[PDB]
Recover the amino acids of this structure.
């Protein structure tokens, strides 16, 4: 004779946007170091990188 | 022959900056030059930055 | 873990490949430094490694 129903409840209708992509951008700093050496051989004749 | 050396540094931002003489509560006193929104070589966790 | 018996170790002469040095480290003569510099270095090291 009868059956149940299906209720739909709506609370808020806000203006949002879609999700095209997602990523995380972390904060970075400045770190560096070096070393001073002498030629003392044929490894540093003219330049450091040959080609 | 002479050996004159020039130092060029191009820049097209011209953001405001200042100097900061920070003194830690332990007793150490150091100085550094912060920029407008740019990290300033954080020393022992402190990352005080300047905004323009 | 255990020092198991080996037939090759009975002759008493072991080749050089059986000697391992964990890590690459070299030494040199040093100079004594005051305690304040060492304390500051230890503080900076323990501050840069909070984990």
């Amino acid at each position: 004779p009868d059956s149940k129903c299906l209720k739909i409840k709506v609370k808020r209708i806000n203006l949002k946007c879609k999700k095209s992509s997602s990523y995380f951008v972390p904060d970075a700093r400045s770190r560096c170091t070096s070393v001073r050496r002498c030629r003392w051989a044929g490894d540093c004749q003219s330049g450091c990188p040959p080609h | 022959p002479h050996g004159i050396i020039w130092k060029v540094s191009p820049c097209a931002a011209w953001v405001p900056s200042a100097v900061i003489e920070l003194t830690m509560p332990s007793g150490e006193v150091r100085t550094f030059h912060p920029m407008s929104g740019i990290p300033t070589q954080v020393f022992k966790g402190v990352s005080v930055t300047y905004l323009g | 873990e255990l020092c198991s018996s080996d037939s090759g170790t009975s002759s008493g002469l072991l080749p050089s490949d059986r000697v391992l040095w964990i890590g690459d480290v070299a030494c040199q003569p040093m100079t004594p430094i005051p305690e304040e510099t060492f304390l500051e270095l230890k503080s900076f090291s323990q501050s840069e490694f909070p984990d």
